[PDB]
Each structure stands twice: as C-alpha cells, then as structure tokens.
Nucleic acid binder design. Structure first.
Ligand SMILES: [Mg+2]
Ligand SMILES: [Mg+2]
Ligand SMILES: [Mg+2]
Ligand SMILES: [Mg+2]
Ligand SMILES: [Mg+2]
Ligand SMILES: [Mg+2]
Ligand SMILES: [Mg+2]
Ligand SMILES: [Mg+2]
Ligand SMILES: [Mg+2]
Ligand SMILES: [Mg+2]
Ligand SMILES: [Mg+2]
Ligand SMILES: [Mg+2]
Ligand SMILES: [Mg+2]
Ligand SMILES: [Mg+2]
Ligand SMILES: [Mg+2]
Ligand SMILES: [Mg+2]
Ligand SMILES: [Mg+2]
Ligand SMILES: [Mg+2]
Ligand SMILES: [Mg+2]
Ligand SMILES: [Mg+2]
Ligand SMILES: [Mg+2]
Ligand SMILES: [Mg+2]
Ligand SMILES: [Mg+2]
Ligand SMILES: [Mg+2]
Ligand SMILES: [Mg+2]
Ligand SMILES: [Mg+2]
Ligand SMILES: [Mg+2]
Ligand SMILES: [Mg+2]
Ligand SMILES: [Mg+2]
Ligand SMILES: [Mg+2]
Ligand SMILES: [Mg+2]
Ligand SMILES: [Mg+2]
Ligand SMILES: [Mg+2]
Ligand SMILES: [Mg+2]
Ligand SMILES: [Mg+2]
Ligand SMILES: [Mg+2]
Ligand SMILES: [Mg+2]
Ligand SMILES: [Mg+2]
Ligand SMILES: [Mg+2]
Ligand SMILES: [Mg+2]
Ligand SMILES: [Mg+2]
Ligand SMILES: [Mg+2]
Ligand SMILES: [Mg+2]
Ligand SMILES: [Mg+2]
Ligand SMILES: [Zn+2]
Lengths: 69, 154, 90, 50, 114
RNA sequence: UCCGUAGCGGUCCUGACGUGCGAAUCGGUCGUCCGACCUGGGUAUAGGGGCGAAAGACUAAUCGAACCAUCUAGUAGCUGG
RNA sequence: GUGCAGAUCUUGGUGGUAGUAGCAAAUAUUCAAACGAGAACUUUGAAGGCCGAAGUGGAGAAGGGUUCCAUGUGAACAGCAGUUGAACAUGGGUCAGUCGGUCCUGAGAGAUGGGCGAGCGCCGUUCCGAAGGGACGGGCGAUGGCCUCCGUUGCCCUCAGCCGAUCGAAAGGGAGUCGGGUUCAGAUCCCCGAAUCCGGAGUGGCGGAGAUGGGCGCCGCGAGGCGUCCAGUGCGGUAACGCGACCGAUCCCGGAGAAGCCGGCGGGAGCCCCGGGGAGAGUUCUCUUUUCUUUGUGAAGGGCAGGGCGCCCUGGAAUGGGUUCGCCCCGAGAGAGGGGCCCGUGCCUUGGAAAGCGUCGCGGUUCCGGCGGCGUCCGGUGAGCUCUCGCUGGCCCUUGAAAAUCCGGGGGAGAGGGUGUAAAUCUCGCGCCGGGCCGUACCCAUAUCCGCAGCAGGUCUCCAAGGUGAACAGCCUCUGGCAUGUUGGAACAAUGUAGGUAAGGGAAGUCGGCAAGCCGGAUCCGUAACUUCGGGAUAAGGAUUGGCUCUAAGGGCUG
RNA sequence: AGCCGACUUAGAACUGGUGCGGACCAGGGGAAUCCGACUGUUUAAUUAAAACAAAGCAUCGCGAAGGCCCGCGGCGGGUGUU
C-alpha cells in the first residue's frame, strides 16, 4: 500500500491506465479514497468534509466508483 | 594438528598481473606488514629465504630443503632449527646439522628460511589431564588411547 | 501475597533456599553500585563536587566504603565542611 | 512418510488398487474355481516389504 | 496462554529454521520465519576490525535488489575500503613515489662528481 | 570442581517376574550430569577380515572366526532303528 | 520303490491335563436419558476423578501406506461384551513461482587418460593427457525484415588459467507470502484482500536522469528573441558521508555466503503480575464496588522512538581524568560540545475496519462470508520465565567447513552528440508477460513405526500457564485431553506382592547391619587429625524455625 | 518539598496442648587397614572391579630411494595438507 500526501498526485494515479477501480470509505474524522492500480492500492486521506465532497465530483468519468459502506 | 604457526605471504607474479599467495612456516619474530625477500641476492635477516651456499657458517635456518627445489622439508616443527656447518665451493656441497644432531651433506643450491620455527617450548608445559591429550590428538589422527600389548590376548 | 507485603510467612521456617539463592549478593552489589555512581555523577554535574573529589569517591565506592546513599551523602557533606575551612583559612 | 517419491507413490498406488475383493459375478462362471481373493493384504499385518 | 506450533515441516531448531512471534488481526500469536541478520562489508585493508559505514547490512542475494547508492560510499575505494586506510594509502603512495625521485636525484648527484 | 533435574548409564535388594509386559523388562535404591558429555542423519572400514579406553568384547536376538548357497546324501571303529 | 510298534522317526489329526493356569504394573467410577431385539463397556447431560505445561495437550522428522473422512454391517478379528473400532463393505479425500525436493558443496563416492590384470574387471581423481567447442573487437561471407539499422550463423585475426566428468544433506548453504474466510475429510496451496522474487523484451511502453549552460555580435525600452564560438559520462557536505538515477569491457583486488564453547550485563518482544473502566457470566444462608472469561492488528512501504559504533569535526588533558557488574580507554588524542552511519522484529500511519472477536437484537419458516446497535479502553511494574538482538570477557599443545551464488572497488580498451524532434547510457518511478516437474491426507506412540500382537521395551525434535518453593524438583489447579490401560460382580481365608506401624531390649539375627531405620532444607555460631596447603568440610557439634501485630533499614520522578 | 513502587533483611511484642523445613522436597556420622592417584571406560543378556585407559616417567627405530604398515599387481597406497 502507498499513501498519497497531496491531492494533485491522487488525480494522476486515478487517471492512470491501470486504475482498475476507485473506492470511497466514509468513517469518522477521515475520508479515504483508494485507487486500485496494478501494483499498489493508493490511499488519499482527507480530514476535510468539504474537500471530500468536491473531490468526489472531481473524479474522472472513465473510472469505476464503488462507494463502500 | 600443528604446533607451528603459518604465515600467509603474498607476492606478485613477474609474468602475469596477479597476486600469488603462499603459506610459509612462520619464523619466530615475524610480524604482519613485514616484507619477506626470496632469492640468491636477498639479504640475511630473520624470515628471509635464500640458498644455503650464500649464508656463512653457523647460520641458523629452518624449512630446509633436502633436495634442490622441493619447497622445504627439513627442520620445520615448532622450535626446531638447523645449523650450517661448512661449505664446499667445488662440487657445490654444504654440511648442515639437523635437529636430531645427525649431520647431512646437501647441495649448495637448496633454500632455507632464516631463523627458528615459532611456537618453541611447546613440550615444556605438562599436559595435566587426559582431556588435553584427547583434544590434541583429535586434531591429528586416531592414535591416542594406547592399549599396552601385555594387556591384550595372544 | 498481601501478607507477604507486610512481611508475613517469610520467617526462618518458611525459607528453603539459601540467602544467595533468594537474594543474590551480585545483584545487591550491582544495584548499590548503580545507585551510588548515579548519586556521584548527579553531584558532579550539579557542581556540588568537582572532578577530583568525584574521582576520589568513585574508587572508595568501588572499594566498598559507603554502605548506602545516605552514608555517602553524610560523608560528602563532611568533606565539604572540611574543605570549607581549608578554603576559608587560605 | 509424507516425503514420498514418484516411483514409491506409484508402487503404493498399484498395491492399493490390488487390495479389493473379487466381484460377485465371477463365480457364476462355468470354469471357475476361485472362492475369494487369497492375495489380500492388510496394512497392520503384512508390511509390504519396502 | 496459547502454545504454538511450527508452520513448516522442519521441526528442528536449525539456523535456517528461526522464528519470531507476531500478533495477528485475528487476535492470535503466530510464528513468522525470520531472515538471517546481514553484515556490513569488511574493509579491504585487512587491519580495521570495524565494518564499513554507509552500506546496508543484508544477505548477499539482496544486493541484486538494492541500488548502487545503497551499496557504496561516494569516494575512491568507497564501499570497499575505510577512509582511514584510504588516506593512509594516499600518503604512502605519494611519499614513496617522492622518495624514489630523491633516490634518482642522489644517483645522478654521485655520477656527476664520479 | 561438589549436591542435584532432564538426558546418559545400570550398584544393591542377589526384590518383582521368571510356560513373564519383555528371547533381558519393572520398582525402590543408585553412578554421572560443561566435558574423555549425550544424540539424529550422512559417510568410511567386511569375515582369518573389520573394529576394539582391551571384556576375546562387538560385527542385525548369531562371534575363541557372522550370515546365505554349493561341494554334500562330506566321514564316523560311535548312538538309535 | 512289496508287509511297521518303536528310530527324542516325517507329515496330518485328536486326547487327559482342563472348563484348569490365567484375563492383578501405572488411584475411579456413579446416576438419568436416547438409539436398539439385546447396554457394566456406544452416545448425550449431570457429577466425582486423573494426566497437572520435562502432560495422558497441541504440531513435525524417520518409518507406515489409506490406517484419514462419510455411510452401512455385526459373519470372522479386536483373549469379556459391543448398538463400538485402526475390522469388513460401499463411496470420497492430499490443489503451491513464495513450503520443501529440484541447485551447491562436505566427509566421501565415482568414470575417462594412464597403469595393473588370464579374465569379469581392479587401482587411481590430476596422477605418464594435443583435456578450452567459449567471448569481446575487427576483417571476410550469407540470410531476413521500416533490406534503414540491429540480429543470425560460416571462416580467419585476437584473447582466455585453473584442477578436474559426475554424484553426494526433505536438519548444512540457498532470492522471494502474509491476513481473513471456507471442508464430512485439504490449506502460508482453494476463495477474497494485500504484497513480493526471478527471468524476458527489436519497435525498446511512458515518465524522469544524462541536459540543455555561458561568451560574442545584433535586435527588443525591458521582459527576453534569432545567429556564431565553445563546454556539458550528475550534485551537495571541512568530514564521517548524503541525494531517485548518475556510461564503460577483457583483467585484477576485496567483501558477503562463512562460522567454536562458556560466563556476565544491557535493549526489544511474547507470557506472567498489579491498579482501574466496559461486556457477559459465577456466588449471594451471611459477607464480598466481589470471583472468572475477554478486551487486537499481518507481509511490504514511509516516519519516529530505542539500541550499537574499533566513525568524523573543534580542542589539548597531572592536582590525571572518564567509566563498568567486572572490565577497560586516553598526546597513536581522554573528557566536554557538535555531527555521521548501521539495526530498528518496538510505536504511529498506508494495509485497516470494510475484515476478526466479545455482547445484545432482528431477519431468511430455512439453503445465508445475512443484516444491524454498542464495545474492542487507560495505566504501572519486575535478580521474573522463554525467544531474539547487542556489548564485553574467559578457555584451547582443541582455533571451531566448503562451494553454488551475489556485490563493491581499482584500472580505462571503448561508445556516444555537435548545440539539438540532442545521442550513447540508467542499479530511479511506474506499465506488460511468464514461472514448467515431484511431494503435500492421517499416526508420529502405553493402539497407525520396530520388537510374530492394540507387547509396561525402543525410537529424533518445536511450544511450555497459576500457586507453593532456590528450582523445567515434588504436590494441587486452569486451557486442552482421557476413562484406569486385553473384562465385570461378590467375598476379605492361608501363602504371596507392594506399603506401613510396634511395648522393653538394641545387631544378641546373619557369611556379612542384607533389608529397613536414623540424618536431611534454611539461618546462626562452631569445625579436628592429616595434607600435594588447593582441601578435608554440609568435618564432627549444638541452637532456631508456626501464626499474628508492629518497628527500623535498603529507591526513582519533578522543581 | 511533593508524588510514586518493588521485593528483601534485621529486631521487638503477643500468642497456640513445645507445635512449627507440620504435606512435599531433603547428606547418617566417626576411627582405621588393603588396592587403584584422580575425572573417564569396560564383558548389550550372571562379573563396574583392584581390570582398561590416563597425564607423568623411560627406552627403541627413522634425515625421506627413510622408519612402521597396507596391498593379487602397477611410476600402487596410509601415516603424509607430515
Ligand atoms: Mg576416540
Ligand atoms: Mg584380558
Ligand atoms: Mg560472590
Ligand atoms: Mg507393526
Ligand atoms: Mg535447509
Ligand atoms: Mg505489530
Ligand atoms: Mg550509500
Ligand atoms: Mg563435574
Ligand atoms: Mg557431581
Ligand atoms: Mg533377583
Ligand atoms: Mg511365579
Ligand atoms: Mg499387563
Ligand atoms: Mg583388508
Ligand atoms: Mg570404547
Ligand atoms: Mg580370557
Ligand atoms: Mg573303536
Ligand atoms: Mg513300483
Ligand atoms: Mg505307526
Ligand atoms: Mg480360575
Ligand atoms: Mg496432534
Ligand atoms: Mg502428541
Ligand atoms: Mg471377544
Ligand atoms: Mg477413523
Ligand atoms: Mg497466490
Ligand atoms: Mg573405482
Ligand atoms: Mg547434487
Ligand atoms: Mg538442503
Ligand atoms: Mg571522546
Ligand atoms: Mg467491527
Ligand atoms: Mg573509474
Ligand atoms: Mg498436514
Ligand atoms: Mg494398550
Ligand atoms: Mg486401577
Ligand atoms: Mg475399565
Ligand atoms: Mg520396638
Ligand atoms: Mg520405643
Ligand atoms: Mg554376631
Ligand atoms: Mg549366631
Ligand atoms: Mg542398605
Ligand atoms: Mg573425615
Ligand atoms: Mg601398612
Ligand atoms: Mg580407580
Ligand atoms: Mg552384563
Ligand atoms: Mg552388573
Ligand atoms: Zn582500514
């Protein structure tokens, strides 16, 4: 597993060709965005509920989204 | 299985770009970083092999050759040495005193490293117990627990 | 075990191992040495004693003069008092 | 042992397959003398060599 | 207290059959078979008893994986010889080469008068 | 080096057993237990040979010359029919 | 091959003994119910017990070979019986790039050359040998495709060491897989989720590095822009060394693999311990804010503690200091400051709460990795036990393996581009494909192995709780396991076997104190002759030991 | 001055029908003689010993085409990587 510190590199890893899926985990005091690539599961950790919702619209349209529960 | 220590001496090959490794028997007083010289024109110091026809009479040697070129056969146990008695410039013969006291006439062209063998006085310390003799001969050969022939059967 | 805290059930009778087997003199010595050398060091960086009295008392501690922390503290105070007349009369 | 070789396991496989009783229909045959399987083997009694 | 068993068929406590304890997400204690401890390279001088610095101590076939900067020090004889015996060999190589020039000069100084 | 456990061994009761749990075991009591220690696996030495801290001990329940086959239906002034 | 009464005759069969010896080593069974024709022995529940962490527990190696699992049977076997079984009869069951074999060498085994030998053959392993079928650069020749530029093989020039073919370890060496779930029986192998190792690539898939800098002459107010002349196989730190790469062959040097036994100390885990919060149980006749169970996070990556350094810089120390448990260190540079490196199995984070577990409750009437509500918390300690890491010391007339394989360095033959759609090159980040063959079930031992057997014998290892206690001693208990070791009932005679106890005497017994008995731990004193001065020695000899209530002494943290 | 914690040692009082290492664990001792120094080993299945070994002591051979020994035989082999 790899942790992406920034938001800008998360968009490139989601826009990779080998990004099989993206999944959103909604727990307390944290929002987790996980992109399943060929080698690693890249995780973006957001502790801002406003930026989580705008990024959720800001995902690329060609990627398959699985909102976890 | 040997009371004498060995010295690993490194030379360089005169014909190929290689470093050559040899195991000499260490003369007493030899330390590391010391340069060991070999040949007819080498000077006379401890740990310095040269033919016996060059050194003067009374020289104390070890690792003496009984035949020219057989890489050392005589006086090479710990604390032992040989003494050069006399030369003979005609017919190239040299008389040496072997560590058993018997004098041998060798050729004048065979080599011996100058000095006594290190680790002398080894038989001075008494083996106090059978265990040290067991550990001594376990490193050499299965010969130690010697049963007397009178204790056997005919 | 709450009575062994008070000291009960540990007399001469209910005692099967030797004194060294129950409380080894080596670990007693090591705790005393670490305590006394800690005290001497803390008295040295606090400038209560200097390098010469620290080196003199280190060897006395190692040579078993002071039995605990308190008798070392009294001896340091006695030496400070005896140095405080030598540096007062000169 | 569990650390078998291929030839030993194949030999054990054959000796497992020969350890079944005779089929019921063979002694309705005309020229028949077999009553049962006399070449049978039990793992506790006969230890198969090896 | 949960007593635990080996996870492989080697039941002897050999040098390769070395384990450590690990706590698991299923709340149980397992064996994890450890790797042997690596050693840093020894200096090529042959006199320094310490091992070299700046090089990771791994098993020899792990050095295939590692990049070059994890395997050497950016210096002449770096990752193979210690800096003390590098500078003590620089001084030696300079000084004996200087003394050879002195001997060459003193040879011609004798041949000039004689 | 001493007491002593696991381990290794086997003093005494000449105990138990002795058509036995057992073609050599069991109980108590014992010797040793950091070293000439104990032990698995691999490997070497083969029969007038090996190997033996030596008892003619061990060498697959077989040892003052193992085991298998053959010479062999060996011979017997001796025993039994 | 012709007549049996014998030959401890041969083979086969059958008696008395005789319903006799016997089914007696390791404390133990009892009540109720179910199935059934049938229950001392099967199954379930309730007891009472034992094995008591060096186990009658949980897993393996060797060996066994289906004994493993499900169902049916009760003919034969399981020395009583059986509704039961490791028996019989039907069917099932072992899934791997990462776990091992496979590869390497060890002691050693073993061809060829050679030698010996009547001969099968034997010796011998580098010894009486023309023992290399390889590679880079060049020249020559052909082939096939953007016949561009590489690749291919044929010949020549050049260069080349090895040490002996081959075999030899399921415990030595040896890259790389862990978490959850799943079966009637298989799981580091199946499923899900996370990784990781090796090999492959013309077009090399992409990005990044190599690297895009300066001078001069013009122009543009400048911001900057065209044209020439060059450089550019990276960069930083005094240093230890660091940064994501950071060309280079034949050759050479070195390292790792690759090292004994023991003692002491320190660090980190796991287990145990104490004080509280939850959740669920147990007692409650009286008391007990009580007693019991449980209360977490993988591999791999990143960061930070912690541990170690025989690493570096300043500076020069006697009134010698620093320092350990012991040691030990220092003008060949100590203390004191400031750095650097290695291991980080510990903590945090990604994994990762989604999964797991506890508890409560709803569904599917059930065939469900079903859906939910909460919780999975805060601390303190230790000459504790085990494992591991590290430091330091002792011992040896004992010095405690090799090779496969991998890496670093020194050299500088060469290669690449003329200022750019820059080139050769890359151990940097991703992206693509593949990993073939064999073993894998179970027992592993008072019933799956060897002893003719379910034989008190033998047979190599891993884990190792609470109390008492010096203790892995003995005894009791918890987790787990079992039914008393090839049978039960009733009696309690002798003689046995295994245990004890005995007035008064105390070896009178006996070959002989045989056997049994006395003594025993710890604390305090005390301790002879003799001696090889080390011992003898726990010499001998006495005194004390329970419970309860106290007192004194022995330490860290903060200012 | 405050806050914390681990096991020990010594002493005193009281107290039980003198019992207290209450089970378990757990050396009988002394004076001498003979032999073997000791630790070790040995007749697996009648003898564990005073037997064997052992260090120490003392002789013997051998300077390598050699001493001792193996081998049917070889420019064979072990000691001898001496
Ligand atoms: Mg021996
Ligand atoms: Mg005899
Ligand atoms: Mg002491
Ligand atoms: Mg059997
Ligand atoms: Mg292995
Ligand atoms: Mg963890
Ligand atoms: Mg580096
Ligand atoms: Mg001893
Ligand atoms: Mg003893
Ligand atoms: Mg008897
Ligand atoms: Mg009888
Ligand atoms: Mg029996
Ligand atoms: Mg022979
Ligand atoms: Mg023997
Ligand atoms: Mg005899
Ligand atoms: Mg006659
Ligand atoms: Mg006829
Ligand atoms: Mg008849
Ligand atoms: Mg009867
Ligand atoms: Mg099991
Ligand atoms: Mg078991
Ligand atoms: Mg029966
Ligand atoms: Mg079964
Ligand atoms: Mg897989
Ligand atoms: Mg051969
Ligand atoms: Mg092989
Ligand atoms: Mg192997
Ligand atoms: Mg310093
Ligand atoms: Mg949950
Ligand atoms: Mg270079
Ligand atoms: Mg299995
Ligand atoms: Mg049985
Ligand atoms: Mg019974
Ligand atoms: Mg019974
Ligand atoms: Mg009486
Ligand atoms: Mg009486
Ligand atoms: Mg009498
Ligand atoms: Mg009488
Ligand atoms: Mg007696
Ligand atoms: Mg005495
Ligand atoms: Mg006398
Ligand atoms: Mg004796
Ligand atoms: Mg006997
Ligand atoms: Mg006996
Ligand atoms: Zn160096």
């Amino acid at each position: 597993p790899r942790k992406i510190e920034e938001i800008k590199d998360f968009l490139l890893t989601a826009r990779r060709k080998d990004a099989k899926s993206v999944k959103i985990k909604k727990n307390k005091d944290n929002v987790k965005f996980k992109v399943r690539c060929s080698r690693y599961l890249y995780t973006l950790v957001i502790t801002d509920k406003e930026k989580a919702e705008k990024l959720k619209q800001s995902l690329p349209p060609g990627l398959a989204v699985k909102e976890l529960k | 299985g040997r009371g004498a220590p060995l010295a690993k001496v490194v030379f360089r090959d005169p014909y190929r770009f290689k470093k050559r490794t040899e195991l000499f028997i260490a003369a007493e007083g030899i330390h590391t970083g010391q340069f060991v010289y070999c040949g007819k024109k080498a000077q006379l110091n401890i740990g310095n092999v040269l033919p016996v026809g060059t050194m003067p009479e009374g020289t104390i040697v070890c690792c003496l050759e009984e035949k020219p070129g057989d890489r050392g056969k005589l006086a090479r146990a710990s604390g032992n040495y040989a003494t050069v008695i006399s030369h003979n410039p005609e017919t190239k013969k040299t008389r040496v005193k072997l560590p058993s006291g018997s004098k041998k006439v060798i050729s004048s062209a065979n080599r011996a490293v100058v000095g006594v063998v290190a680790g002398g006085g080894r038989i001075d310390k008494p083996i106090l117990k059978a265990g040290r003799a067991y550990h001594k001969y376990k490193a050499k050969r299965n010969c130690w627990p010697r049963v007397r022939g009178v204790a056997m059967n005919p | 075990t709450l009575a062994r805290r008070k000291g009960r059930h540990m007399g001469i009778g209910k005692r099967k191992g030797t004194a060294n087997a129950r409380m080894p003199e080596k670990v007693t010595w090591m705790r005393r040495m670490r305590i006394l050398r800690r005290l001497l060091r803390r008295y040295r960086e606090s400038k209560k004693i200097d390098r010469h009295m620290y080196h003199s008392l280190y060897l006395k501690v190692k040579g078993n003069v002071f039995k605990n922390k308190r008798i070392l503290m009294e001896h340091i105070h006695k030496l400070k008092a005896d140095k405080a007349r030598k540096k007062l009369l000169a | 042992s569990s650390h078998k070789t291929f030839r030993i396991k194949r030999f054990l496989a054959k000796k497992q397959k020969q350890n079944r009783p005779i089929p019921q229909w063979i002694w309705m045959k005309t020229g028949n003398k077999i009553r049962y399987n006399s070449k049978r083997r039990h793992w506790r009694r006969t230890k198969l060599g090896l | 207290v949960q007593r635990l068993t080996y996870r492989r068929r080697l039941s002897y406590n050999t040098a390769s059959n070395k384990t450590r304890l690990s706590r698991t997400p299923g709340n149980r204690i397992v064996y994890l078979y450890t790797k042997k401890v690596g050693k840093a390279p020894k200096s090529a001088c042959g006199v320094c008893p310490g091992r070299l610095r700046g090089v990771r101590a791994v098993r020899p076939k792990v050095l295939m994986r590692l990049s070059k900067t994890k395997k050497h020090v950016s210096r002449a004889y770096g990752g193979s010889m210690c800096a003390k015996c590098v500078r003590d060999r620089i001084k030696r190589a300079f000084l004996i080469e200087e003394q050879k020039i002195v001997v060459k000069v003193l040879k011609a100084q004798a041949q000039s008068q004689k």
